[PDB]
Design a protein around this ligand. Structure first.
Ligand SMILES: CCCCCCCCCCCCCCCCCC(=O)OC[C@H](CO[C@@H]1O[C@H](CO[C@H]2O[C@H](CO)[C@H](O)[C@H](O)[C@H]2O)[C@H](O)[C@H](O)[C@H]1O)OC(=O)CCCCCCCCCCCCCCCCC
Ligand SMILES: CCCCCCCCCCCCCCCCCC(=O)OC[C@H](CO[C@@H]1O[C@H](CO[C@H]2O[C@H](CO)[C@H](O)[C@H](O)[C@H]2O)[C@H](O)[C@H](O)[C@H]1O)OC(=O)CCCCCCCCCCCCCCCCC
Ligand SMILES: CCCCCCCCCCCCCCCCCC(=O)OC[C@H](CO[C@@H]1O[C@H](CO[C@H]2O[C@H](CO)[C@H](O)[C@H](O)[C@H]2O)[C@H](O)[C@H](O)[C@H]1O)OC(=O)CCCCCCCCCCCCCCCCC
Ligand code: CLA
Ligand code: CLA
Ligand code: CLA
Ligand code: CLA
Ligand SMILES: CCCCCCCCCCCCCCCCCC(=O)OC[C@H](CO[C@@H]1O[C@H](CO)[C@H](O)[C@H](O)[C@H]1O)OC(=O)CCCCCCCCCCCCCCCCC
Ligand SMILES: CC1=C(/C=C/C(C)=C/C=C/C(C)=C/C=C/C=C(C)/C=C/C=C(C)/C=C/C2=C(C)CCCC2(C)C)C(C)(C)CCC1
Ligand SMILES: CC1=C(/C=C/C(C)=C/C=C/C(C)=C/C=C/C=C(C)/C=C/C=C(C)/C=C/C2=C(C)CCCC2(C)C)C(C)(C)CCC1
Ligand SMILES: CC1=C(/C=C/C(C)=C/C=C/C(C)=C/C=C/C=C(C)/C=C/C=C(C)/C=C/C2=C(C)CCCC2(C)C)C(C)(C)CCC1
Ligand SMILES: [Fe+2]
Lengths: 30, 37, 315, 30, 207, 37, 449, 56, 48, 32, 35, 30
């Protein structure tokens, strides 16, 4: 219920997802 | 079911990226104090 | 043209589908989807289930103060025993939830699904002109699942002794089983552990040796490397022999561990070595087996808090 | 709240599995 | 099914039918109730079968008041008291007395009230002692603790009202309807006890 | 126990049950005789 | 023998070289039958030589003598043993018959003709004949029916069988009126296998067993006569593989199912497997413990009906989910157990309190104590009791050994069905050796699945 | 009785049917499927000759 | 703040000490034992 | 004592009866 | 509650009949090999 | 604070990820 746990989970879900999407889009465009 | 002729690709040059990032960060700076209340 | 049934069987037995819907598939798919749906719905939200049959329920649902690790689908109530308990046999749906019907439904549909999955593996092996023994290898986890979910409840006389469908349920079941049967001291569990460790070892070794030999299909240099390393020249120089050994080891290990499980289902426990080394006078000397016995005794006293009422646990 | 987070995580994992099974890169020259 | 039909069935036929939880029905006899000769009799084969399990609950709405609401049963059957034995005295004027001594006089039960809350209790009439007319005899009984002192975490009295409805003087076999109110489970002191109202049928063979 | 008339032949019986197992071993010996042809 | 170059089968698969050699295959089968009979006779003699008639059979780890005793040879009332001569006779008869069978097998394997398709056309057969195979099947069906009728005659005319449900302790009885009603006989087969029903493991009287054996013998004789004078219909040819390995796989699957059924029947049934010889079953031990404790506590002076347990359900007696009066505690799971020593105390709606008060005979109490002592629990060291026990007992019930061994055998034979059925189907198709490498079926299929 | 139940768990009825409508449904579904298969049998090829079918 | 050192003595006046919790044990039973080492008192588990 | 003696004698005789046939056939050049 | 039993019986019977009659439809000749 | 912090984090992250994905798609083709 703590804010720290929820925000850590959200960041861990989102940031690597964004990084992987960046790399995949770069690869697919090339 | 065949290759669709209406095929186009979106582009976004670096200037547009800087404009968008600046707009997002400025809006966040402006509205963060209000949202935190 | 062809009749309706001819077209239907042509579509079913077609290798052009994205996923092969075999004649075993026509049963595998509905059973597996039904089990999946019921499992998901019960895991997300389900009232506490009276596993022990002593009018105290335990909660295993996310909406009832649980998380992923401690959530589970509680096994069927002890009062039910081995009786068939479908939905239509309960007076009300809430009663079905209270007594623990979903566990029985999921177990039955899941066992049928895995059997038909093995059948479908054989079927698609046949339709593609392959040698049909992948299903034989797949039978080992199938046998283990059957022993865990079906044979042990049959031997113990109740479905409440089966494995709960949850992460903490697995650990509770394992602690229970070691307490009541001494799983660790059985030769078949030792063979299963040996099979699993050897499977990991051979997987790592084969992967490393093949990857290293894939220079700019395995060449004979890897065989020479392996012979030089462990002094086992000509032990494995045939690729077919090596891959057959890789397939055979873990499958045999899992077969034997599942057989040991099913054997203990009928109260044929493992080795017993407590009170073996005895002094000349007659005093008993403790051994590591005796410390294992002490741990089992500690596990057994807190096994069921308020279920037993007789000195000996015959059930 | 936490139950919703767990459900979202499981649903996302299942969706990723579905996309990987169906929207896969076609294999060429095996 | 009457007593003769019940006793005429083998155990295998009864098993799985739910008959074992039922109570004998008095098809014969008279409803006059004036054919019961005054005196004392040994009451045997005293059986009781409930029909409703209304529980007193506080209304969820602020403006509402406590009321008896219906419930859904959880435990499969296992709620019928049977084989009770005691004494039954009937007076010439019209007064009567009923007392229960032994038998299966208690049964644990759990019922869920609407909203998901399930409440357990111990349906019992043990040590009953009622005195009054044939219609409207009233008494009280003891309710033991729901669980024993040996139970670990991870006296009370209740009233009852019987009323004989049909009597068969040649073979006894008195039948009627009863109503009772008893406290709920109060173990562990985690919540105040609630009141369960139970109506049902009762059969007895006083010979 | 065996009948008294057959009492002296008790030891022989004690060896009888394990005989079939030996058969399978014999097979391997036979294969060793022909050098596993 | 042969070698790998001529046959294509390595030594570790040498018996596969006999698929197309009728004489050698027949010799091998006869030798194996001789081995089976030899083990039967030798083990019977071994058990006889170590048998102490004073003690019960299940307390000495005997698994073959109980069968003969159930057949009703040298057994008195209550399972008491009168004499042990018939066991010796059966052992020696199997031993000598096995000697003869072994001589026949070694002759047919070493000297007899390799293939007997031309010298003895009656016994010859091609695996794809589809008409000689049915003839052999009919012959063996007739033989099986004759065996079943032999059992029926033994139970009906020549002596009797050990009825364990007879008044008092069970004894040998003649089944004068076997249950031949079609509905009763065929109700068992379509009954559910789950708890309470138990499928054919729920037979609770010798009359039903004898009637069923009459039915199966007659059906097998009729089916054998049918199959001798008939060939499979086109729909049968359409949905079967006609090769030796295919028939082997069918037999493997059927016999694995039979092994599983035997495991369950040995574990649960106690009518065709009397407890006086095989020992008490799983549920029987727990029910006996509860009964003995109830009797002892009642004798000490207590109200068994008004004995609330720690959980409030009831220490001694409670109600089943259907409504019957049953023993309380953790033994609720075994509430549908039935036994000769407990039925006389059962009324229309379960256990009767009045009968439990003053209707218990001493033999029932003694049998209950004896059964509760010798629970089917055991250890691989032959310890007995729960795993947390001292080394003071040397008891493991024969029921546990039978169940475990036959379940393992059934599982392995199901695996054998899988393997041999797959290989037979592949070999009949023609790609059991490998992909063609020049006409690969996958390469001609549309890509992207 | 508090409520109503099917009361057939331990009765061991044949094929688990206690109402004739269940048996009628069983027979009807089986007959419909068998009729469809029989009609479509013409497309599966006839094994009229004595020696036919997959064999080795 | 500090509550001061606690000394436990039985009815006879014998001095008793609590067996300190070792690092391994997440939960440790409480035992009052005399100077010699023999346990003289303890909490009866939970409901024993 | 004597019972164990006869048990071992019978055991060794019966065990040796097996490979003795193989040895005799190999010496005499049989079709083994 | 019996309607649910009827529906389940119908579905199970339909699927089992499909399975049974599928393998009677000249299944062994569905292989891709040459014979 | 949980509502505001979560909203601010999402507003910072998601549109920036979208813009970065578009730019990386653009920059791949020189
Ligand atoms: C070292 C490591 C080696 C690792 C590789 C091993 C490869 C071979 C593995 C199998 C070897 C088996 C024989 C050796 C074990 C043994 O000493 O075996 C000893 C036993 C018994 O030995 C005798 O046991 C006697 C007492 O026990 C017996 O008598 C008792 C009387 O109360 C009881 O009846 C008890 O149940 C019964 O076992 C005495 O102690 C004697 O001194 C003693 O010689 O031999 C017997 O029983 C007969 C043996 C054949 C059994 C027949 C097959 C049974 C299949 C059951 C399958 C169950 C499921 C799988 C297992 C789980
Ligand atoms: C496999 C697919 C599932 C099979 C059906 C589920 C079996 C459930 C079960 O508990 O079945 C148990 C039944 C027996 O049922 C029992 O039958 C008993 C009959 O005893 C009664 O009747 C007896 C008569 O003497 C006695 O009187 C006894 O005291 C009395 O209680 C009782 O009714 C029990 O309550 C009842 O549970 O066994 C049987 O029907 C035998 C039928 C074969 C079952 C084999 C199952 C083996 C396990 C699966 C192995 C798969 C391997 C896959 C490898 C890959
Ligand atoms: C699952 C377990 C259930 C519990 C146990 C039940 C046990 C039952 C045992 C008896 C039935 C066993 C059937 C097993 C399935 C195999 C059927 C089969 O291979 O069958 C294959 C054969 C093939 O038949 C042949 O088919 C050939 C091809 O015909 C085609 O070609 C012909 C011209 O050449 C014609 O044109 C014809 O019209 C056309 O169809 C020829 O017609 C031959 O003459 C003909 O003999 O069929 C036949 O054996 C004839 C039909 C056999 C009996 C079928 C009974 C089906 C049910 C009947 C009741 C239904 C009620 C419905 C009610 C609905 C409303 C409520
Ligand atoms: C009566 C049933 C039966 C029959 C007639 C056959 C007959 C045949 N099988 Mg099949 N098979 C069966 C059952 C049967 N099998 C079962 C139940 C299994 C599952 C285990 C198999 C698995 C199997 C495989 C995997 C293969 C065969 C093969 C063969 C052929 C050659 C076998 C040979 O020469 O072995 C020679 C004998 C040996 C190599 C000795 C093996 C000894 C092992 C280790 C068993 C040890 C037993 C041990 C004491 C107890 C085990 C544990 C216990 C708890 C059960 C032959 C046609 C082979 C073949 O060529 O196929 C065409 C082949 O590849 N079979
Ligand atoms: C009980 C199981 C069994 C049976 C019945 C058979 C039977 C057979 N096998 Mg198989 N086999 C088995 C197990 C079995 N085998 C196992 C476990 C293996 C793995 C090692 C093999 C591996 C194998 C191979 C590799 C081959 C066979 C072959 C054969 C056949 C010829 C054998 C021969 O000529 O040897 C001749 C052997 C001898 C002359 C040596 C002496 C043996 C004698 C007969 C021992 C008799 C002892 C007995 C107590 C005497 C009783 C006398 C009586 C009057 C009382 C025969 C039908 C061969 C075949 O296919 O034939 C074409 C073949 O090539 N087998
Ligand atoms: C190592 C191998 C091995 C051994 C030692 C055994 C040993 C045994 N098995 Mg097992 N079994 C095995 C492998 C083995 N099995 C395998 C591989 C399978 C397949 C999975 C089975 C499947 C199996 C089943 C299904 C059953 C057994 C049973 C038995 C027992 C009795 C055997 C018997 O009498 O057969 C039966 C004997 C015959 C069929 C031969 C014919 C007998 C005639 C017809 C009887 C005539 C008698 C007559 C009435 C006497 C009166 C004559 C006159 C006065 C009229 C015995 C303990 C039985 C048992 O006790 O279950 C627990 C049983 O039901 N076994
Ligand atoms: C073990 C002995 C044996 C064997 C191997 C065979 C083998 C055969 N028989 Mg014969 N038969 C036998 C005994 C045997 N029969 C006996 C004893 C009788 C007398 C009743 C007959 C009477 C008989 C007739 C009248 C006919 C055959 C036919 C056939 C052939 C087709 C069988 C088939 O595909 O069934 C397939 C079976 C089905 C499709 C039925 C549905 C199967 C469901 C799923 C099973 C339901 C099981 C039920 C619920 C009970 C549970 C039991 C439990 C073990 C699971 C085949 C060659 C037929 C043929 O072509 O030969 C001329 C034929 O017309 N048989
Ligand atoms: C793989 C290994 C397999 C090992 C098998 C070992 C032997 C198993 C022996 C099983 C005997 C079954 C006898 C008949 C069973 C029966 O009639 O069920 C009858 C039961 C009983 O059904 C219940 O009966 C109760 C008692 O009366 C109540 O009446 C309930 O209302 C009723 O639902 O129905 C079922 O349990 C479901 C049966 C169908 C299950 C799906 C089968 C799918 C088969 C696909 C392949 C077909 C070819
Ligand atoms: C083919 C072959 C084989 C096999 C074979 C076989 C398996 C055979 C068998 C055989 C047999 C199976 C035999 C048997 C025999 C037996 C006998 C010969 C017996 C006799 C008996 C006796 C002599 C007895 C006596 C007595 C009595 C009567 C009782 C008491 C005791 C006494 C001792 C006195 C193998 C693979 C291995 C190898 C190759 C070849
Ligand atoms: C003696 C006895 C009895 C009885 C018995 C009987 C009566 C039996 C019968 C039995 C039977 C009567 C059985 C049957 C069976 C059947 C089966 C088992 C079948 C199978 C089938 C199959 C396997 C098929 C498959 C398929 C199909 C589906 C089609 C074609 C193709 C294929 C192959 C895929 C009693 C209980 C009384 C008592 C005790 C004992
Ligand atoms: C009953 C009886 C009889 C008969 C007997 C018999 C007939 C026996 C047989 C026996 C036999 C028939 C035996 C056999 C044996 C064999 C053996 C014992 C062997 C062993 C070997 C080993 C152990 C080795 C192995 C190996 C090889 C060589 C290769 C691979 C590697 C190894 C090293 C593993 C008579 C009438 C005389 C009288 C007395 C009693
Ligand atoms: Fe590889």
């Amino acid at each position: 219920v703590n804010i720290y746990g929820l925000t850590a989970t959200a960041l861990f879900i989102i940031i690597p997802t964004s990084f992987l999407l960046i790399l995949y889009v770069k690869t697919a465009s090339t | 079911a065949r290759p669709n002729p209406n095929k186009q690709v979106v582009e976004l040059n670096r200037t547009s990226l800087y404009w968008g990032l600046l707009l997002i960060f400025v809006l966040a700076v402006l509205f963060s104090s209000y949202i935190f209340n | 043209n062809s009749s309706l049934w001819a077209r239907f069987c042509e579509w079913i037995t077609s290798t052009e589908n994205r996923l092969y819907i075999g004649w075993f598939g026509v049963i595998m798919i509905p059973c597996l989807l039904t089990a999946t749906s019921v499992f998901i719905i019960a895991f997300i939200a389900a009232p506490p289930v009276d596993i022990d049959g002593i009018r105290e329920p335990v909660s295993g649902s996310l909406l009832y103060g649980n998380n992923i690790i401690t959530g589970a689908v509680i096994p069927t109530s002890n009062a039910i025993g081995l009786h068939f308990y479908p939905i239509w046999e309960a007076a009300s749906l809430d009663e079905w939830l209270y007594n623990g019907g979903p566990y029985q439904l999921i177990v039955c549909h899941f066992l049928l699904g895995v059997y038909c999955y093995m059948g479908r593996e054989w079927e698609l092996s046949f339709r593609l002109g392959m040698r049909p023994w992948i299903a034989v290898a797949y039978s080992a986890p199938v046998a283990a699942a059957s022993a865990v979910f079906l044979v042990y409840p049959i031997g113990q006389g109740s479905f409440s002794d089966g494995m709960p469908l949850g992460i903490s349920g697995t650990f509770n079941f394992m602690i229970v089983f070691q307490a009541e049967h001494n799983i660790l001291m059985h030769p078949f569990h030792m063979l299963g552990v040996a099979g699993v460790f050897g499977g990991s070892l051979f997987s790592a070794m084969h992967g490393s040796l093949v990857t290293s030999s894939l220079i700019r299909y395995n060449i004979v240099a890897a065989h020479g490397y392996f012979g030089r390393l462990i002094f086992q020249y000509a032990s494995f120089n045939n690729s077919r022999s090596l891959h057959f050994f890789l397939a055979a080891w873990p499958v045999i290990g899992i077969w034997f561990t599942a057989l040991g499980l099913s054997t203990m289902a009928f109260n044929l426990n493992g080795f017993n070595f407590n009170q073996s080394v005895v002094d000349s006078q007659g005093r008993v000397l403790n051994t590591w087996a005796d410390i294992i016995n002490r741990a089992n005794l500690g596990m057994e006293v807190m096994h069921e808090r308020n279920a037993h009422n007789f000195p000996l646990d015959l059930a | 709240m936490e139950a919703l987070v767990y459900t979202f995580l499981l649903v996302g994992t299942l969706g990723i599995i579905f996309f990987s099974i169906f929207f896969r890169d076609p294999p060429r020259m095996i | 099914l009457t007593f003769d039909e019940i006793q005429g069935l083998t155990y295998l036929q009864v098993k799985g039918s739910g008959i074992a939880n039922t109570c004998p029905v008095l098809e014969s006899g008279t409803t006059n109730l004036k054919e019961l000769k005054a005196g004392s009799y040994k009451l045997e084969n005293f059986c009781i079968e409930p029909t409703s399990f209304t529980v007193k609950e506080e209304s969820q709405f602020k403006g509402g008041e406590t009321e008896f609401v219906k419930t859904k049963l959880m435990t499969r059957l296992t709620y019928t008291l049977d084989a009770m034995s005691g004494s039954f005295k009937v007076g010439s004027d019209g007064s009567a007395e009923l007392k229960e001594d032994d038998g299966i006089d208690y049964a644990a039960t759990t019922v869920q009230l609407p909203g998901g809350e399930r409440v357990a209790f111990l349906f019992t009439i043990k040590q009953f002692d009622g005195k009054g007319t044939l219609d409207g005899i009233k008494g009280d009984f003891l309710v033991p603790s729901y669980r024993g002192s040996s139970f670990l975490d991870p006296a009370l009295k209740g009233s009852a009202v019987f009323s004989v409805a049909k009597v068969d003087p040649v073979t006894g076999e008195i039948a009627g309807v009863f109503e009772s109110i008893q406290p709920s489970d109060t173990d562990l002191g985690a919540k105040p006890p609630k009141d369960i109202k139970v109506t049902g049928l009762w059969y007895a063979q006083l010979k | 126990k065996l009948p008294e008339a057959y009492a002296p032949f008790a030891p022989i019986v004690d060896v009888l049950p394990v005989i079939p197992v030996f058969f399978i071993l014999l097979a391997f010996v036979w294969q060793a005789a022909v050098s596993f042809r | 023998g042969r070698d790998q170059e001529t046959t294509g089968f390595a030594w570790w698969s040498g018996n596969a070289r006999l698929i197309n050699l009728s004489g050698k295959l027949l010799g091998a089968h006869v030798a194996h039958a001789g081995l089976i009979v030899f083990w039967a006779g030798a083990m019977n003699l071994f058990e006889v030589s170590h048998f102490v008639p004073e003690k019960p059979m299940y307390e000495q780890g005997l698994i073959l003598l109980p069968h003969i005793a159930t057949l009703g040879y040298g057994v008195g009332p209550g399972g008491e043993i009168i004499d042990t001569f018939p066991y010796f006779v059966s052992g020696v008869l199997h031993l000598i018959s096995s000697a003869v069978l072994g001589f026949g097998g070694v002759y047919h394997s070493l000297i007899g003709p390799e293939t007997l398709e031309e010298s003895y056309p009656f016994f010859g057969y091609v695996w794809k004949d589809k008409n000689k195979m049915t003839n052999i099947l009919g012959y063996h069906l007739i033989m099986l029916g004759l065996g079943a009728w032999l059992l029926v005659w033994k139970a009906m005319y020549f002596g009797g069988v050990y009825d364990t449900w007879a008044p008092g302790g069970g004894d040998v009885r003649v089944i004068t009126n076997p249950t031949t009603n079609a509905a009763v006989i065929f109700g068992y087969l379509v009954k559910s296998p789950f708890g309470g029903d138990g499928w054919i493991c729920s037979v609770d009287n010798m009359e039903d067993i004898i009637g069923g054996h009459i039915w199966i013998g007659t059906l097998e004789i009729l089916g054998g006569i049918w199959h001798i004078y008939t060939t499979p219909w086109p729909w049968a040819r359409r949905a079967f593989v006609w090769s030796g390995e295919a028939y082997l796989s069918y037999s493997l699957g059927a016999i694995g199912v039979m092994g599983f059924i035997a495991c369950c029947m040995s574990w649960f049934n106690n009518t065709a497997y009397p407890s006086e010889f095989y020992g008490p079953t799983g549920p029987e031990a727990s029910q006996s413990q509860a009964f003995t404790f109830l009797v002892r506590d009642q004798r000490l002076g207590a109200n068994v009906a008004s004995a609330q347990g720690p959980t409030g359900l009831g220490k001694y007696l409670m109600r089943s989910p259907t409504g019957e009066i049953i023993f309380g505690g953790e033994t609720m799971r075994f509430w549908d157990f039935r036994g000769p020593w407990l039925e006389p105390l059962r009324g229309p709606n379960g256990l009767d309190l009045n009968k439990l008060k003053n209707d218990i005979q001493p033999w029932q109490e003694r049998r209950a104590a004896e059964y509760m002592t010798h629970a089917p629990l055991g250890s691989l060291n032959s310890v007995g009791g729960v795993a947390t026990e001292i080394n003071a007992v040397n008891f493991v019930s024969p029921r546990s050994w039978l169940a475990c061994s036959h379940f393992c055998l059934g599982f392995f034979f199901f695996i054998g069905h899988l393997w041999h059925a797959g290989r037979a189907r592949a070999a009949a198709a023609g790609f059991e050796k490998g992909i063609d490498r020049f006409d690969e079926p996958v390469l001609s299929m549309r890509p992207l699945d | 009785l508090v409520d109503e139940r099917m009361n057939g768990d331990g009765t061991g009825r044949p094929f688990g049917v206690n109402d004739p409508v269940l048996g009628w449904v069983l027979l009807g579904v089986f007959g419909t499927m068998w009729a469809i298969w029989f009609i479509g049998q013409k497309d599966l090829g006839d094994f009229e000759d004595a020696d036919d079918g997959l064999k080795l | 703040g500090w509550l001061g050192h606690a000394s436990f003595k039985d009815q006879e006046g014998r001095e008793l000490f609590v067996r300190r919790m070792p690092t391994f044990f997440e939960t440790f039973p409480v035992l009052l034992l005399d100077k010699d080492g023999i346990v003289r008192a303890d909490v009866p588990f939970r409901k024993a | 004592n004597i019972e164990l003696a006869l048990t071992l004698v019978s055991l060794v005789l019966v065990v040796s009866a097996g490979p003795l046939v193989v040895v005799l056939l190999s010496a005499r050049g049989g079709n083994l | 509650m019996l309607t649910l039993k009827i529906f389940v019986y119908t579905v199970v019977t339909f699927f089992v009949c499909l399975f049974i009659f599928g393998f009677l439809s000249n299944d062994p000749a569905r292989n891709p090999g040459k014979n």
